């Protein structure tokens, strides 16, 4: 049968985390992060927040030895249909995220938040 | 752009003529008035082609499928194994959208 393809069991969850414009400006739960469940620590894909000018993000290490900081891409503006009126949110990509994982964020976003 | 993924049932098979009945589920995108099918989801490994009758009614359209990706979903009546086919020449971006939609909507193992 030629070759063999197999998709590993990967799941996309979300969690509250800190973010900001400076290294120190990252403070308690100002955004929501999209991450991947992988054995070699968590792989954060994108950030979703209500702020327009964010550059850094903090995450506690999976083992617990310390903290990690990640650079953010320029945000992508989009609108969600919220029952209490449409709300505008800002979506931040990881500074070095490839277009493949970018699509995963979009498919997960359209499935976890009400778009358009 | 703020894009949303919808799904529909369609026909597929191993040959051009083998595309019959309703043996697969397709992931498509709402673009302009038309539809952009991204991937195919079915319970068969034989699939190579997929057919759609044209909306106007002049004929039918066929699209070549990539080698399937095997995966297992947790269904209440026992785990079922499904095969996922991408459309020929799909860019890595739209590939993730199909994968991202599945990983957030279905429990795999």
Curated annotation (Swiss-Prot), chain A:
It is found in: Host cytoplasm, Host perinuclear region; Host cytoplasm; Host endoplasmic reticulum. Residues 4-116 form the Nsp9 ssRNA-binding domain. Is a dimer. Interacts with NSP12. Interacts with host SND1. Forms a primer, NSP9-pU, which is utilized by the polymerase for the initiation of RNA chains. Interacts with ribosome signal recognition particle RNA (SRP). Together with NSP8, suppress protein integration into the cell membrane, thereby disrupting host immune defenses. This is Viral protein genome-linked nsp9. It comes from Severe acute respiratory syndrome coronavirus 2 (2019-nCoV). The chain holds residues 4141 to 4253 of 7096 of the full protein.
Swiss-Prot record, chain B:
Residues 1-109 form the Nsp9 ssRNA-binding domain. It comes from the Viruses. Signal peptide: none annotated. It is found in: Host cytoplasm, Host perinuclear region; Host cytoplasm; Host endoplasmic reticulum. Forms a primer, NSP9-pU, which is utilized by the polymerase for the initiation of RNA chains. Interacts with ribosome signal recognition particle RNA (SRP). Together with NSP8, suppress protein integration into the cell membrane, thereby disrupting host immune defenses. Is a dimer. Interacts with NSP12. Interacts with host SND1. This is Viral protein genome-linked nsp9. It comes from Severe acute respiratory syndrome coronavirus 2 (2019-nCoV). The chain holds residues 4145 to 4253 of 7096 of the full protein.
């Amino acid at each position: 049968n030629a070759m063999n393809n197999e998709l590993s069991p990967v799941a996309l969850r979300q969690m509250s985390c800190a973010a900001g414009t400076t290294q120190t400006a990252c403070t308690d739960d100002n955004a929501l992060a999209y991450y991947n469940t992988t054995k070699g620590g968590r792989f954060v894909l994108a950030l979703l927040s209500d702020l327009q000018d964010l550059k850094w993000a903090r995450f506690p290490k999976s083992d617990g030895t310390g903290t990690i900081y990640t650079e953010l891409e320029p945000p992508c503006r989009f609108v969600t249909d919220t029952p209490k009126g449409p709300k505008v949110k800002y979506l931040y990509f990881i500074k070095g995220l490839n277009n493949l994982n970018r699509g995963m964020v979009l498919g997960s976003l359209a499935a976890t938040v009400r778009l358009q």
